[PDB]
Short mmCIF file of C-alpha atoms in Angstrom, two decimals:
data_model
loop_
_atom_site.label_atom_id
_atom_site.label_comp_id
_atom_site.label_asym_id
_atom_site.label_seq_id
_atom_site.Cartn_x
_atom_site.Cartn_y
_atom_site.Cartn_z
CA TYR A 153 0.00 0.00 0.00
CA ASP A 154 1.07 3.55 -0.79
CA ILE A 155 0.65 5.50 2.45
CA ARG A 156 -0.28 8.78 0.72
CA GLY A 157 -3.83 7.46 0.32
CA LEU A 158 -4.42 8.01 4.04
CA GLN A 159 -2.32 11.11 4.72
CA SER A 160 -5.30 13.48 4.51
CA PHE A 161 -7.24 11.61 7.20
CA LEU A 162 -4.19 11.74 9.51
CA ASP A 163 -4.45 15.53 9.51
CA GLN A 164 -8.03 16.08 10.62
CA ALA A 165 -7.95 13.02 12.86
CA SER A 166 -4.97 14.64 14.58
CA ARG A 167 -7.06 17.83 14.59
CA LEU A 168 -9.60 15.91 16.62
CA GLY A 169 -6.83 16.13 19.24
CA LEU A 170 -6.69 12.40 19.90
CA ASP A 171 -3.81 10.04 20.81
CA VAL A 172 -2.89 7.59 18.05
CA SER A 173 0.13 5.46 17.14
CA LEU A 174 0.92 4.13 13.67
CA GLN A 175 2.32 0.70 12.87
CA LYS A 176 3.24 -1.42 9.86
CA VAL A 177 2.29 -5.05 9.31
CA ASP A 178 5.04 -6.76 7.33
CA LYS A 179 4.64 -9.31 4.55
CA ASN A 180 4.96 -12.38 6.79
CA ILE A 181 2.53 -12.74 9.69
CA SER A 182 4.11 -15.39 11.92
CA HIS A 183 7.34 -13.37 11.82
CA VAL A 184 5.35 -10.35 13.01
CA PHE A 185 3.98 -12.27 16.00
CA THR A 186 7.49 -13.67 16.51
CA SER A 187 8.68 -10.08 16.79
CA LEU A 188 5.67 -9.37 19.04
CA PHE A 189 5.60 -11.92 21.82
CA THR A 190 9.36 -12.37 22.16
CA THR A 191 9.44 -8.66 23.02
CA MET A 192 5.90 -8.32 24.44
CA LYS A 193 6.13 -7.91 28.17
CA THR A 194 3.14 -8.21 30.48
CA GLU A 195 2.49 -4.46 30.28
CA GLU A 196 3.04 -4.67 26.52
CA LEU A 197 0.52 -7.48 26.19
CA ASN A 198 -1.77 -5.35 28.37
CA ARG A 199 -1.53 -2.23 26.24
CA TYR A 200 -1.75 -4.40 23.13
CA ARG A 201 -5.07 -5.97 24.08
CA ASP A 202 -6.14 -2.40 24.81
CA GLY B 102 13.66 24.21 -1.19
CA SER B 103 11.15 21.76 0.26
CA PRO B 104 12.11 18.77 2.43
CA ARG B 105 12.91 15.49 0.75
CA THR B 106 10.78 12.34 0.57
CA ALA B 107 11.84 8.90 -0.63
CA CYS B 108 11.47 7.38 -4.08
CA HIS B 109 11.21 3.64 -4.47
CA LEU B 110 12.11 0.83 -6.86
CA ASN B 111 9.35 -0.91 -8.80
CA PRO B 112 9.86 -4.71 -8.99
CA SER B 113 12.35 -5.83 -11.61
CA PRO B 114 14.44 -8.92 -12.45
CA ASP B 115 17.85 -9.30 -10.92
CA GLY B 116 21.27 -8.45 -12.32
CA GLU B 117 19.84 -5.20 -13.68
CA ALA B 118 21.39 -1.99 -12.33
CA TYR B 119 22.66 1.06 -14.22
CA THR B 120 20.34 3.95 -13.20
CA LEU B 121 22.35 5.90 -10.62
CA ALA B 122 21.44 8.06 -7.64
CA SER B 123 24.06 10.43 -6.22
CA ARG B 124 21.67 11.40 -3.39
CA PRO B 125 21.75 10.06 0.18
CA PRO B 126 18.48 8.63 1.54
CA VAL B 127 16.18 10.08 4.18
CA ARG B 128 18.73 9.43 6.92
CA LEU B 129 16.86 11.18 9.74
CA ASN B 130 14.02 8.71 10.41
CA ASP B 131 16.24 6.84 12.88
CA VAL B 132 17.48 10.23 14.08
CA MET B 133 13.84 11.04 14.79
CA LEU B 134 13.54 7.64 16.51
CA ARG B 135 16.29 8.87 18.79
CA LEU B 136 15.18 12.46 19.14
CA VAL B 137 11.50 12.05 20.08
CA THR B 138 12.79 10.27 23.19
CA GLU B 139 16.00 12.29 23.58
CA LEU B 140 13.63 15.23 23.88
CA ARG B 141 11.52 12.85 26.02
CA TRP B 142 8.34 13.33 24.04
CA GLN B 143 5.20 11.26 24.54
CA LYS B 144 2.60 13.09 22.42
CA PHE B 145 3.31 15.73 19.77
CA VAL B 146 2.29 17.18 16.41
CA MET B 147 4.28 17.25 13.17
CA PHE B 148 3.89 19.24 9.96
CA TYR B 149 4.89 19.29 6.30
CA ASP B 150 4.24 21.78 3.51
CA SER B 151 1.97 21.59 0.46
CA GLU B 152 4.26 19.96 -2.12
#
């Protein structure tokens, strides 16, 4: 995906004054969860189910 | 005089490279990864011009 297709909504959504992070999902999924839970702490698993 | 974005490579077969780029990349993304915590920032707003 080319990220410029969402860059307008980032602006006004930030102008709602909210609190938002931005993250990529890579091409392989099990490697993403491998990078997740090997570095997910308890508090990280907490904020991630949030 | 605007800031500089990245340009990519469309998919191509291998062993195929002549088109040159004398320009360094956007080398400050990792610098920003440092600096938004070296300035100890949690929540903040960023901007970029029209073009």
